């Protein structure tokens, strides 16, 4: 059921992903022309529920301090779409690769 | 004087109930308990702290501790003793293993 976003790590239930997906990266998915189900992956890990990404040092470590409070996964298996990868040069893989 | 007084105590405690034991048994008891410099107590910490065979020593109270000390200090357990020969299941030099038995090739040939 529940899945994790490959791009930035947000975790929500399958119904929530069908409803709105990633509000943090809905724009990036819309430009890249890829829906959320293909960017999300079933195997994930490191699920931190951030309430204050601006002040939290964990959010700075995981590069999510600029976004809104919620789930963010340190490890999200799979390979993000190449189109999104080129659209995000500063993005680096969250599964330890590269 | 310690050996003499100790024999005197053992004689007293034995003869209190009227039983008589031969002197040489008490003498051996005190002499083993005094063969070292001081009084080797017949205890976990006494005679079994001496330097006999490790397999003999381990059969008394501290088994595994003495075996570890034997492994660390690399003791050559003598096998001249009862408990080690019993552990090995061979004729301990008790009274019958105190010698060997041979064949007179000489006299076996001399008669015939």
């Amino acid at each position: 059921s529940e899945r994790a976003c490959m791009l930035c790590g947000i975790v929500q239930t399958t119904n929530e992903f069908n409803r709105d997906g990633c509000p943090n990266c809905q724009g990036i998915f819309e430009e890249a022309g890829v829906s959320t189900m293909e960017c999300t992956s079933p195997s994930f890990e490191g699920l931190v529920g951030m309430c204050k990404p601006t002040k939290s040092w964990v959010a700075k470590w995981l590069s999510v301090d600029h976004s809104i409070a919620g789930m963010y996964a340190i490890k999200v298996d799979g390979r993000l779409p190449a189109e999104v990868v080129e659209l995000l040069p500063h993005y680096k893989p969250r599964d330890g690769s590269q | 004087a310690g050996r003499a007084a100790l024999y005197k105590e053992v004689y007293n405690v034995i003869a209190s109930d009227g039983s008589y034991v031969n002197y040489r048994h008490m003498a051996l008891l005190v002499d083993v308990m005094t063969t070292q410099g001081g009084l080797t107590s017949v205890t976990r910490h006494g005679f079994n702290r001496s330097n006999t065979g490790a397999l003999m020593r381990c059969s008394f109270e501290e088994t595994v501790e003495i075996l570890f000390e034997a492994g660390a200090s690399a003791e050559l357990d003598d096998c001249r003793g009862v408990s080690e020969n019993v552990i090995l299941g061979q004729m301990a030099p008790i009274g019958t293993g105190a010698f060997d038995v041979m064949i007179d090739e000489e006299s076996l040939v001399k008669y015939m």
């Binding site: - | 570890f68 034997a70 090995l88 301990a92 008790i94 293993g97």
Partner: protein
């Protein structure tokens, strides 16, 4: 039946060393143990059917000795080698 410590003592007093040997080896449990001369360990891969004797780990094929010991003594030694202690058994005297 069992041959307790006290009865072992009584036989030790009697002097029947042959009795004790027979009673604690042949009548109880006798195990043949091949050992290597260099190491003196129970590590001999004895193929009596093929008569092929070797203690690998010392490379020898010629200096191998059987002993008769109780299975309890065998398996004490196995526990000691499981517990990082060496039961070593040899063909000589050194102190003399």
């Amino acid at each position: 039946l069992r041959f307790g410590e006290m009865e072992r003592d009584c036989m030790i007093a009697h002097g029947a060393a042959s009795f004790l040997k027979e009673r604690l080896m042949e009548a109880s449990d006798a195990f043949r143990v091949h050992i290597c001369g260099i190491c003196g360990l129970m590590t001999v891969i004895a193929k009596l059917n093929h008569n092929q004797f070797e203690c690998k780990g010392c490379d020898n094929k010629i200096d191998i000795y059987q002993i008769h010991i109780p299975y309890a003594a065998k398996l004490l030694f196995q526990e000691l080698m499981a517990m990082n202690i060496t039961p070593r058994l040899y063909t000589d005297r050194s102190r003399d």
